[PDB]
Amino acid sequence: EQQMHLNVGLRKIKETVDQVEELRRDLRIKSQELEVKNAAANDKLKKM
């Protein structure tokens, strides 16, 4: 029973790792896109 639970628990932990990595990768990509857009608006604002 304990080994099955631990194995079932590892399966669920891998599932949660898949959920967070999908959120993180998309969170990191959005953060990088927002930083480049912020850096662009800063350069245009400095030129103006």
Partner: protein, 48 residues
Amino acid sequence: RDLEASIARYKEEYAVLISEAQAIKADLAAVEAKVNRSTALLKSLSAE
């Protein structure tokens, strides 16, 4: 008077461009705090 009005309009556009940048920066700092903590969270999940 026309040049003073153009300077005031440009200064208003810059204060608007700076306020928009600060919202983009705080949004980016939240999205990064999320990125860094989500990478480090995953480092924890894998250790577990």
